[PDB]
Symmetry: T
Subunit: 159 residues, 12 copies
């Protein structure tokens, strides 16, 4: 499949791997956010339940932008169940936790991991000579870092 | 209270039966709507604004299902009974306490009443279908989906303490 | 029930007086909201759809003014009293007839009750202002504007026959 | 015509039965949609604007139910039959009078046709459920809820004369 | 975790399994719909690309309704990457197809499987004495059967 | 001087300005009439007729503004003040002592029918002066005025 | 049927002529609206979704132009004739085939029928202007713009094969 | 008879009807004035002043309707026809031969200031008659009229 | 380029004539849209923001009329000619100055070009109607209404100095 | 600074008095707007998201009441004083702590400051009415309604601990 | 063409360099916008409506980026050059063929030009950053994201044939 | 104050550097937001309405950028400093004059302050990038694009005098 897009061939290759790696952990994190959303229980239920839906919409939008960029560079976006299981960097989410603080701890671990993977991806994409992909990761980084603060702010003090 | 003439051909015996089921449910749904605002105004505690605002969503839903149920009484040739006196004589809910304020207090009182109305509407689906009115049973099924979801949102605030 | 501490500095005797005015008005406004839907569902006659739909706009208005009155009770450190039992013990409205159907019969019944509530709210403006609480008086003035317009809409339907 | 292959695993005998029920209902729902606009344009009398406008809301609902019924035929591998000739050969409604103008005369003509289509769709829910197709029965149940309410809105204009 | 919801205990158990089984295949199908959306190529690209986004929104809405019902009945909704991999009934989606007809064939297989699983779930949920859950599956069935027709209509004739 | 590059001939401009300012005065009076009736009608169809007349008033506001703006595009002065309308309207004074809905409908039907018919003539007179753009403004107004006249007459054309 | 009195002063002979033009065009526009949905449900082939959705846009436009044409008949004192029997007796379109599925086959059948209604409406503009009714000719000119654009959209799918 | 359950005393009703119908006539004239200026103004600030005056006209339409509806709630007849407005307005005839923006702003400032000041007095006279609900209608109108008068005067209060 | 076959029955010589009128107008409308943005970006002076924003509304209008004119060419079986090279060979507008900045200088330059295009479109109405195509004439009349209003808006800024 | 001439006829002594009241209140409202965002960004604890989002609603309300107060100063011929230096010189609020994070600590600090501005505005209503300016007293009454409701929303999070 | 004075402190050498980069890109983006509509009007073939409508989304995007690029020229003290003559002298695109109709023909011509502009804007990001203007580089980066996505949407229609 | 723990792995020295840059910028952006409204209320002259309205659009943008900058401080574990006292101690803007009214005098005062804040944020992009924080540099880049356009809109009102 040819493309007129003239980003260098080795920059395309490099950046497609960065993209598809991040895609898998973003899709996993999208699944995790709904898993916590459905099963959380405790005094702050409705506010955290609803917040997690806004995070899921953001993850859906950044995972679509990342996958569409793979394809613009001539690759294959890899977001099926099997590609995500083989490529995700996140540990399996616990399916036997319910308390809000337990889900906040588990989400903070994973949100922090994805936020920091995307932070790295900005630099790696820019250094590869693709500032257009680096801006896709920068936009994702701004939402991931804000979502990470929102979650951490719930546990940084007890009252 | 005159029976009204209509081309709707649901049998007369099914109409009478389901009108009773509807009006009974209507009274407890109106009382539950009043209860929901009573709690909403008077709740106090650390989760005030989120619980306050959630209760207004519930009240809109109870207004919509109470209206669909009352309209169905009239479609079947009956009289919808939703005045203050009808609600007082027919509601199945215990009087709501007017001297509670803590959020957890209101949540326990709301869960009692939401669970009673949720379960009443779950029975009304089966009773309406068995009386031979699946259109009325579908009205109650839509109400049951929102009452079971609302009962879950209330209970999930107290099922764990952290 | 218990009084709540607040930084709001309206004098305590003014708070006590105006909470009584607001809770009294709240019970009749909630009863009038129930009456509005009772008529909405059961009226029948040549202008059915227009009058049926108009009454839904009136019910939304009553819901918004009832909410603003109740919230004001609580801002002044009181307990808003809007449960079925509080409304039944405090409403000034006569029980609404459940055996009427003609539009003109509902209009008469509604005009009587809308008039009573419009005039109650009119007096509440003045009583609130004399107690030194123009903020509460403005809540009642906003409600009075809507109640007097709604009363006019109802009466204009029966003031002429053609 | 011809049967189209689908992965949809509703049994073939149930598909054939329910396609017949859906296309039969589609023809009377399309005729009723044309009837609704025929009456809407030609209404004359004191109740004109509200009845004229209400009939457009009913037309939009009949368009949406008729589209849902037709799409279900095709989902099951059939051919939806909604052309002028299919509707003429399959409708159960008597020709609408083109020489009536008084609103009461259109209301009675509409009540007869709306009653027939409401009651046809009421039976379609049970026939579809008996065939083992609750998905199609739900399409007819949603239609029934709007037909029964529309029938009540029509009849409520003539059940009382004031 | 108690609930006032009085559906019988054995109906709750039965229906939670039906729900969580369907949840896994619906989430897998949601992933598949975006995998095809990103990678399809051919003359009908934009129309099929855009249609698949509407299907994904529908699957997101029915998977949320199914998962929230599990929890209303006192269960645990199971939608993490690992729960979906262990419970999905769909075969791995091919990651090396691009032609629109290849993706339509693969989506038709999977949409047909999920549509037919949900059709069964209506009956099983109703027979268990839970018409409120059966209506959740009925609403999903109407969208799955329409989406299945939309996909099949593209291949039922060649012009 | 209201010098413009618009090349419609100067005599056509002056002819069409007069047609537009005459219609503007009767449209503004009819807009005042519509609210006068709206506020004071009483009877069984009150809310439906009350709300309908507000839709008619918005339409008259939009056509009156399009007619006035066209006068100014053609180099004229739009004449829509209270005194201009009193000296140019063709409508008879609306009665201020009627309340029954049927009495307002008869009074509105007379005045709506006069304005609808003046606008119908204005299409042809503007086209015949060689200004089909102004004729289109009046055609758009005639479609609304004729529809509004039918909605009013439909209420009185049969007794029930 | 009967003619209704109106203050509208279009001359009586022009009213009679244009009512005939309007009711004639109304019948073919309503039949084209039915055809457009018939094709839409039963289309099969690679450009399914785009053509299916486009035909829904065309049906909304035909609904709005048919309503504008009908409403003009009544403004001029006539009776709008849009029932199933009136459409059957007056339509100029040939019966739409119910056994075609391929999208190119629906496109050819739609192009024949849209071309006929576009050319009928083009002629209606000049016949209405000849009768001295530019207001009615504008209704038809608005319809002609949408019909000629919709005919080009259909024909542009078949004028080239790649 | 316009018998109502509204219990404002009959003498207060008649006093406040007169205040409302007097203000209604000057508000309707000012709404006509606002469009008269809007159509015919010419000069460097054309589009901004042209569009602002449409916002003012919508506000006058809404206050005039609230004032008229209050007359009828109190058992009166709202008087807003062309002839009622000509016999009751307090505004001087607007000039039809002015075009410069500064000339329209001066003419509008005179008339906006008169209506703003009549409405200011109407608040107190309605409250003193024992009708704070009608006083609130005039207070809402005064807030818009005083803001509109400031927007007009701000254009002329400094030269640049 | 080549002629396209269509069912549209406007006579072939009329089609040919009106395609020439439409393509000629299209080139000057596209050049005027470019000129409108050139002025929008570069104007400077005391009424900058109001005039800058107004020109964006004019550009959207020119875009919509340019699109309607071009689409009409193609409906009549022609080829719409809107590329940079077609516009350069067919525009009637003089090159816009790139070294002006004062608002009054841009207004003068725009008034000249808006006047030329408004007057071209005015003549196109008549030429289209004389060729027997009132549908195309109505496209030009809609554009003329917007062009004559936009010309007035521009000229009203310079017709007085205060 | 300088006073500007206006046709507004509120007496000159009333204008001077109310301009002082307005500018005084403007300074404390702008400082409260800054405080509300200071707390919002730095809140930490279990009810983070609900309190964070609620404070944004309060900031929009303070922006709209501060703008209405400032605009009234200028309507009366004065100079609105809302710059950083004017706020610093005129605010009645104590400096907000920048080293607090726990949500209960921000709630106590916000309650002190919202209570002060609510009570200042309550007094401003009566001082404006005493000066003979009911139009200005209405601006402050509208602000008082939102300040008293926002103060209750803050205090209701701390009046009970569960 | 005068240089305009501004407080913006980007160095003069960077301003001059980036103004040239912007104006060059502006000319090819305007030509590409014209090309996009040229194709949109004249395309014919089986995927007509989907491709026709997609091209209008592209044209809106090119209008938005062309505007942001031209505005940045002026912010840096330059003259935006977007007239017909400037575009003709500066565009890098070959003249678009006016005698092609097949969708695949238009797609190949569009992909050539979209690829040239996409690649020009990709270079402009780096050239603007290296000239020391990351704010301008961000304008080009936003444009590059939409041009690369649009180039992909065009190429994905021809990268496979089924 | 104190540092909050976060999983955010931007190096600690980069976090400290960039928190200083963000809080310094926040104080001048808040002061500029207050300046913008100070000028907006007190403008007098022929250009009043369009300048008054434009300044509210700039205020909304400064609110949104200032919120984004403050939130980034907290994301990095810092304390956002936006209270009246922090702004007074940290702003780089000279006090805005309260005794100017002519629009040209406010435009020059605004141009000075907007220029200073545009140029401060331009340097913040490069300082943040030098610290290894492109996420924070993008926040300042988005702010820069709106500050530079707002500065050009202000300066374009005074760069020419006609
Ligand atoms: Fe996408
Ligand atoms: Fe209802
Ligand atoms: Fe509330
Ligand atoms: Fe459909
Ligand atoms: Fe959910
Ligand atoms: Fe206008
Ligand atoms: Fe209609
Ligand atoms: Fe009104
Ligand atoms: Fe187009
Ligand atoms: Fe303001
Ligand atoms: Fe722009
Ligand atoms: Fe924020």
């Amino acid at each position: 499949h040819k493309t007129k897009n003239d980003l260098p061939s080795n920059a395309k290759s490099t950046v497609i791997g960065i993209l598809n790696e991040s895609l898998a952990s973003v899709i996993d994190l999208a699944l995790v956010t709904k898993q916590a959303h459905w099963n959380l229980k405790g005094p702050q239920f409705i506010a955290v339940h609803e917040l997690l839906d806004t995070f899921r919409t953001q993850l859906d939008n950044h995972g679509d932008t990342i996958a569409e960029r793979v394809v613009q560079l001539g690759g294959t976006a890899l977001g099926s169940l099997q590609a995500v299981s083989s490529t995700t960097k996140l540990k399996a989410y616990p399916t036997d936790i319910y308390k809000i603080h337990d889900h906040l701890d588990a989400l903070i671990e994973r949100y922090g991991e994805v936020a920091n993977m995307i932070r790295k991806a900005i630099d790696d994409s820019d250094e590869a000579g693709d500032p257009t992909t680096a801006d896709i990761f920068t936009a994702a980084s701004r939402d991931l870092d804000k979502s990470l603060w929102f979650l951490e702010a719930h546990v940084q003090e007890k009252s």
